[PDB]
Structure formats: C-alpha cells, structure tokens
Amino acid sequence: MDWGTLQTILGGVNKHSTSIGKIWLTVLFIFRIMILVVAAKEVWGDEQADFVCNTLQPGCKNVCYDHYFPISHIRLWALQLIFVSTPALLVAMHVAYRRHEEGSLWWTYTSSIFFRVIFEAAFMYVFYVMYDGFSMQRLVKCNAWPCPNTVDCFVSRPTEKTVFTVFMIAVSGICILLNVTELCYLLIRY
Amino acid sequence: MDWGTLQTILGGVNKHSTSIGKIWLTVLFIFRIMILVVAAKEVWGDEQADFVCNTLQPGCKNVCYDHYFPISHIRLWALQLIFVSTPALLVAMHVAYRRHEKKREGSLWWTYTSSIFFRVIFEAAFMYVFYVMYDGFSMQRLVKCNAWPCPNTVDCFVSRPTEKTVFTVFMIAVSGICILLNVTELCYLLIRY
C-alpha cells in the first residue's frame, strides 16, 4: 500500500500524553509501520510462488505450504498493529464525546495502557508456539495427504525472513518494557 | 487506488449521534475496513491462479472453480460494508441543513429508528448468505467436482484454506457484535416510547 497524510493524525494524537509516552512509544510505533510497509511486505511477496516441493503428485505443494504456514508473518504483524492502535484512537474519541456537551479521564487512560501490554504479549506468544522459535528453516518435511510417504519442500528467502522476524520481535519487547515502566510511574502517583 | 480524504468524511459523520453509536459502531466499522484492505485482500490474491485439479481435461478447472466459489468472499464483504454504510450516511446528511438553517422534532426519531432498523437487516442477510452458500464457516482443502466437461469425478485443491478460515471467523465475529450493539439502541430508544 501507500499513504497520503499521516502527519496530521500523529500531531493531534501527540497531545495529552506523558513525557516518554509522548515520544518513545510514538516513534517506536511509526518505526514498526515503516519497517512493515516499505521493506518487509515485499520480502513475503512470493512466499507461495517460489515454494518448491520435490514430487510429482498434484496438490502436494498446496497442502504442504498450508500445513507449515497457517498464517503468514506479515499478516500477523498487521493484525497486531491494528489491535495495539485502537485504544490509542478511541480515547481520542471518548474525550471528543465529553467535549460536545478527573477520575474518568484518569481511569480510561490507565486502562488503555493495561490493554496494550496484554495484546503485545499475546501476539508474541503466538509466534513462539505457532512457528517454534524465531528462526526459519530452509527445508521442511511434509507427509499430509495427498502427498506420498514424505516429501522435501524448500522455503523461499529463509535468511531474510529471519532477520526481519528478529527485528520486529525486538522492538515489540521494548514497547512492552516502556509500557510497564510508564505504568508503574503513574502508580506511585496513585 | 487507496484511501483519501476520509478523515473529513468521518469527521463530519461522527457528530450528532448516540453515545455508543457515536464511537463503538464507527470504531468497529473502521475496524472491519482495515482488515479488509490492509490484510485480507491479498490472501485471496491467487484464488484461481493456485487452484489445482488432478486431470488432463481442458476446461475442467474453470467449471470446477466456478461451481464451488460462485462469488468470492472478499467481494461479499465489500458489498456488505457498502450496504450497511449507506443508511448511516444519508441520515447523517439529512440533519445538516436544519442545523445550518437553525442558526440563520419527533419526525427524525422515525428516521433514526429506521436506519438502525435497516442495518440489522443487512447484517443478518449477509451473515445468512455465508452460511447457506458456503456450508459453514470452515473451508476445506479438498473439493470433489463432477460437473461437465469433467470426467467421472475430479479432485481439486484449494489455496490457503487455513488462512482464509481465520479471516472468515474474524469477520463473522465482529459482524455479530455490531448486531448486538445495534439492538441496544432500539431498546434505549423504544423505552422512551
């Protein structure tokens, strides 16, 4: 995809936030989006076109690809970004509700931060359990029907996909830490 | 082609509506659009390029694909969003000139309950069509096809059945929620009689 105007939306959402919340989470957020669109989205461009299986059985390539990649990484990251951005924007709408006509504003703001840490941890769990670590393999062995006994299939761009996987996981771990420290920073204020 | 000056379009439309309808319906509504355009629309990119049938007959692939997918999933969701969007739009437009003229009321409650009423119809109808026409929300790896010109019976294999199931389940769930949100409006709206 592409974009036409993201500076206006970031400027408005910038206001009414804490020191680190104003900058650090925001710059890390646009950091992840930039990585996703300009670079990574076309590494996974031919994930199925260049999948190769050493067999003559028709339909074996379809099932073996689907058995090992139930959902591709880039569409896992796209889902994650949407989930961890909605609490940011709806609170911008809840205040717009009260504008048309302090505990409430405080209660909402502290609640959103509790959600963001939840979603990121949940999604990082899915990568680990689904893909068995963060390293992708050149060779996969598949024996689902209709494939005969056991078939060798070869992945496209295994090394580059590993690099971006490590990169997206790292900045997600940072965002979790930033949320936790900022959260406990408010708790002492009570 | 991609998103344009929707922020002003949405900025205009959110004003002058009920509290949860102010945000929750709209937020869930842009929730569906993002999934449709950002992620889902390229899962279905090679639906027919990667259909594979175990046969040597010319034209068996065309008839078998057309028989099991009379209309693609992403085209139904696009249609559904258009239909549910319109009643929100026009009624939001209808109030504009009066607010314009007032600076220069039981009727609208008939209109407002009408638009709320219509949305639930379109949500229910489209969720109904998925069930009857695709035989549940789960997509299978293997389809057996015996339409002419195919010989006796042919095995054909779908592309990305597991990923298409995940998004199908997701779109149905958020569609089900919007129905629940809508009916709450009428209960708050009818309780005043």
Swiss-Prot record, chain B:
It is a multi-pass membrane protein. Its main location: membrane. Changing residue 34 to A: Loss of gap junction ion conductance, probably due to very low open probability of the channels. Can form functional channels with wild-type, but with strongly reduced channel conductance. Residues 14-20 are cytoplasmic. InterPro entries: Connexin (IPR000500), Connexin26 (IPR002268), Connexin_CCC (IPR019570), Connexin_CS (IPR017990), Connexin_N (IPR013092), Connexin_N_sf (IPR038359). The keyword Cell membrane applies. Changing residue 75 to Q: In PPKDFN; the mutant protein completely prevents the formation of functional channels. The chain crosses the membrane at residues 21-40, 74-94, 112-132, 166-186. Gene3D superfamilies: Gap junction channel protein cysteine-rich domain. Disulfide bonds join 53-156, 60-150, 64-145. Residues 2-13 dip into the membrane without crossing it. Keywords: Calcium, Cell junction, Cell membrane, Deafness, Disease variant, Disulfide bond, Ectodermal dysplasia, Gap junction, Hearing, Ichthyosis, Membrane, Metal-binding, Non-syndromic deafness, Palmoplantar keratoderma, Transmembrane, Transmembrane helix. Changing residue 73 to R: In PPKDFN; the mutant has a dominant-negative effect on connexin trafficking. GO terms for cellular component: connexin complex; endoplasmic reticulum-Golgi intermediate compartment; gap junction; plasma membrane. It is found in: Cell membrane; Cell junction, Gap junction. Changing residue 143 to M: May contribute to deafness. GO terms for molecular function: calcium ion binding; gap junction channel activity; gap junction channel activity involved in cell communication by electrical coupling; identical protein binding. Structural component of gap junctions. Gap junctions are dodecameric channels that connect the cytoplasm of adjoining cells. They are formed by the docking of two hexameric hemichannels, one from each cell membrane. Small molecules and ions diffuse from one cell to a neighboring cell via the central pore. Belongs to the connexin family. Beta-type (group I) subfamily. A hemichannel or connexon is composed of a hexamer of connexins. A functional gap junction is formed by the apposition of two hemichannels. Interacts with CNST. Forms heteromeric channels with GJB4. It is linked to Deafness, autosomal recessive, 1A: A form of non-syndromic sensorineural hearing loss. Sensorineural deafness results from damage to the neural receptors of the inner ear, the nerve pathways to the brain, or the area of the brain that receives sound information. This is Gap junction beta-2 protein. The gene is GJB2.
